[PDB]
């Protein structure tokens, strides 16, 4: 309707329009060139002097005598419906399936109003994955937003695929009867290349999850600024399907490193003073407003559990992207290169991962009473084995004493018969029995954190 012309300046993602009084702050503008092409753009600074618009697509072909700028949606909104569980979307939610769009039940703000911590709830109920490391030591429960770090080329996609296809909350040990509803996957991808895309969609059509899932694909060959909109647009639908229909939404936010590179690009186009390694200061607030739109609320049986996949640049816990992620979120799962050369699938090193809220998930009745002491004894014994490996590499094998060989046999028996597994799905009882098999290698007395009841009931 009310167009604007008078573009003064165009460079990078930015363009400077003038005499722009009535563009509300943070609105959507479509850019129209000479010949019919229309582009997305978001407003990020308004004055009666001028206004600034970032461009959701490539800035190729814009002249200055044309390319009018037209207004829509004072704040950026997504039309949202429930006829939505089968069709994929681009980086800005145009559907690419050869079908008409959703008939919107509602209109929601894509930014997300911040959740009230009074209206939250303790994330209680255990989720098993099949993977014994997670389901023994680093607990994954309903309502947690735990990221999975990846190294250079470690199979993060296959870990996410296995937790997508074969993770299930177990109602029977929780003691509530059952409703046994399976999950609902919000898979939002930000610059996965083509091969990972092929693997995820073929995995989902082989497990039959595409009748209950949604994909917001923002590929590598897509333009580079709509990555800022993709996770917030996905988590809007996630909030929707959780908190209006009593679901158990699991959200796979793939490869946050491309989100952070796009954020770095939009922060450096506007000259803004960065923190460490060239990332701007508001990256904390934006990763917060992605992550903390997740959790459980009181009374409503909807729920959101997130796996964000990180890619650590120099496979370290110290770079600003995994560092600020691990400061924001609660509990993470880290992969490592050192186990991966030994064929160990899935290559999870079990020291640096930590569940934040294992303590409320497992315990009496819910999992089994042993589980906390069992996990703590495994942590302490395996850490002792790992840091005695370096001393063995210093002083040689024949310079060893008693219990050193027991810790070392514990270490490699652990790393080849607890973490090392195929795509088989181990239960909680099966993984705990394998844990007692590995705890059978140590003589007693050193099993300090396991109390007398468990050591007198389950040794062997």
């Amino acid at each position: 309707k009310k167009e604007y012309t008078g573009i003064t300046y165009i460079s990078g993602p930015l363009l400077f329009v003038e005499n722009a009084k009535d563009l509300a702050y943070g609105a959507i503008v479509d850019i129209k060139d000479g010949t019919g092409r229309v582009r997305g753009g978001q407003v990020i600074e308004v004055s009666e002097e001028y206004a600034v618009i970032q461009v959701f697509e490539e800035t190729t072909g814009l002249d200055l005598a044309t390319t009018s700028v037209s207004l829509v949606e004072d704040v950026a909104r997504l039309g949202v419906s429930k006829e939505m569980l089968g069709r994929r979307f681009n980086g800005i939610g145009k559907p690419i399936d050869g079908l008409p769009p959703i008939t919107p039940e509602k209109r929601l703000p894509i930014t997300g109003l911040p959740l009230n911590p009074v209206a939250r709830r303790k994330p209680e109920q255990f989720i098993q994955t099949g993977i014994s490391t997670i389901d023994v030591m680093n607990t994954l429960v309903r309502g947690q937003k735990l990221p999975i770090f990846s190294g250079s080329g470690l199979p993060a996609n296959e870990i996410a695929a296995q937790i997508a296809r074969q993770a299930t909350v177990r109602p029977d040990l929780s003691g509530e009867g059952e409703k046994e509803e399976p999950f609902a996957v919000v898979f939002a991808a930000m610059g996965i290349t083509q091969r990972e895309l092929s693997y995820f969609i073929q995995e989902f059509e082989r497990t039959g999850a595409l009748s209950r899932s949604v994909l917001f694909l923002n590929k590598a060959d897509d333009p580079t600024i709509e990555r800022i909109l993709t996770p917030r647009m996905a988590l809007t639908v996630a909030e929707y399907l959780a908190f209006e229909h009593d679901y158990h939404v699991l959200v796979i936010l793939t490869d946050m490193t491309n989100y952070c590179e796009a954020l770095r690009e939009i922060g450096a186009a506007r000259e803004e003073i960065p923190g460490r390694r060239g990332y701007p200061g508001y990256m904390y607030t934006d990763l917060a407003t992605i992550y903390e739109r997740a959790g459980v609320v009181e009374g409503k049986k909807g729920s959101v559990t997130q796996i964000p996949i990180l890619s650590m640049p120099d496979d370290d816990r110290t770079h600003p992207i995994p560092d600020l992620t691990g400061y924001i979120t609660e509990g993470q799962i880290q992969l490592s290169r050192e186990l991966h050369r030994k064929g160990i699938y899935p290559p999870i090193d079990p020291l640096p991962s930590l569940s934040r809220l294992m303590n409320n998930g497992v315990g009496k009745g819910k999992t089994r009473e042993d589980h906390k002491q069992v996990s703590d004894q495994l942590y302490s014994a395996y850490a002792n084995g790992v840091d005695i490996r370096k001393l063995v590499a210093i002083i040689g094998e024949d310079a060893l004493t008693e219990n050193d060989r027991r810790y070392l046999q514990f270490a490699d028996a652990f790393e080849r018969f607890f973490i090392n597994q195929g795509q088989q799905n181990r239960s909680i009882e099966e993984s705990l029995q394998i844990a007692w098999a590995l705890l059978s290698m140590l003589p007693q007395g050193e099993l300090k954190r396991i109390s007398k009841d468990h050591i007198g009931k389950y040794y062997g």
């Binding site: 300046y9 990078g12 200055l64 060239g278 590499a393």
Partner: protein, 577 residues
Amino acid sequence: MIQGVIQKIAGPAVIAKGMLGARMYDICKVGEEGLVGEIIRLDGDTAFVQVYEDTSGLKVGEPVVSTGLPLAVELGPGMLNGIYDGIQRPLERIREKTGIYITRGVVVHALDREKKWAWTPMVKPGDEVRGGMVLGTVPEFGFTHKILVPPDVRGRVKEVKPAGEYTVEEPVVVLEDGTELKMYHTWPVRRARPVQRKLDPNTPFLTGMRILDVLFPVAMGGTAAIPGPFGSGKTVTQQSLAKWSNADVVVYVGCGERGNEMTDVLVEFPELTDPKTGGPLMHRTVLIANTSNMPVAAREASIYVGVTIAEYFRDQGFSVALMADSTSRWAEALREISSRLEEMPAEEGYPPYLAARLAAFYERAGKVITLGGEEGAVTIVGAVSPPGGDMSEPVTQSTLRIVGAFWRLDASLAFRRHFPAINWNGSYSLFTSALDPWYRENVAEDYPELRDAISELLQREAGLQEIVQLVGPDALQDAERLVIEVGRIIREDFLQQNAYHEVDAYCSMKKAYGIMKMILAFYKEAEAAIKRGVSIDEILQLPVLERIGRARYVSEEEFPAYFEEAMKEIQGAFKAL
């Protein structure tokens, strides 16, 4: 055809005013001497042109003529047996009209417009054509270069000329629309030539060298990254991949590079011969040289010219191999223009959209099926040159997230003049899980388990050599020395590809399978006797060790008859015990 004058000149940048409506990324003839520039940072009524030649000697107030339409190449027949520069104007033409140098601002043609090629039609009047449909064929060298519909052309055919011979711009197909079709057509170098659908990579790009397909293979649609500092080859390896592969066209795009490499490739190719056809190798290699003395802005033209030519040849049923050499200089070109243009730098001057540029580059590769009905694949070998190892640099940890394989060259292992210098661990390929049925049908039956055994023995030697170095090899028990000696057999016998000897410079898969099966039968028959009480120093200079040690220099016409008798010696060598 907007036309202004030069306001200011700074660096290689010409910022010219009066451009009230010059659209983005146009080619503009800047200066009165026909220089070629790209247009960014529109501002008021004033553009910001970078020039692809130099600019030392221009003035103020010379006219700048925009050409309206953006940076594009001309895809057609005649590209093979060809060198090009960054803006695609071929160098031997310039030698025919300048001399033995390059002058600022010639105006020449990207293709020869006086060569009479041979038409043969494959459509009739009244047909429907959409983009990417087969029109006609031309025999180019050993070839059927099929000229096809440009991908923005759809309509009814009015007439098509018969099988004569023609100039490359001759209007030969006129639609029932007012549209003509020449033998070439233009295309901008910042857009994928669009496909119907992308497939999944299931067939290996047979890289030809022993380690690069035995241990860490690349698929036909896949991408690979080769790091490696100076003195670690990199050019022996690129020229070996250009010589010995199973490509259909090799597009060798070398930017920021020596001149001796380019003239080496142009001297020694028209006598050597690809394994499939006959004739010179040069008739399947289009090479885009950009020597490091040529002006710095041309590199970002050059790389996209290369991948555009790769897509034009993947649209014609050809499994195109592309070698993008020294893309760190392309990253330096981005650094130089972003520091000329006064934006924010991040992580040592590389502008923060370098990951977007590099990802949109590598994502043009893959295995597709084109609109005509052919299949195709384009693969990219990207040679990154990081400064000193130091892999946390932004170019390398940008390209590490978007490659299907990663072949880390070393610096220590290339100081005993081992070649090639592929690291055994820390280099990894993600196509081993998908190339298994093809291997199990087409190299052996038990091929994957065999290299599983080879991989774990390499891992075991790497985990054993450390205590070998620490406590000294005095403390060999019995078997760890046999592990060391099999390690010495492998890195002195199996990974020793010369690339200069005339039968070592190409290896097959069957010969690699034969040598690996020989090594594993050797180890599984010596480990039987090592617990019988044989001295480990006794077992070394048995004469069949020479018979494996120079068992790679036989050809395929010599290898099975030598091979089965060598294993007969492997069996009978321990009956002498």
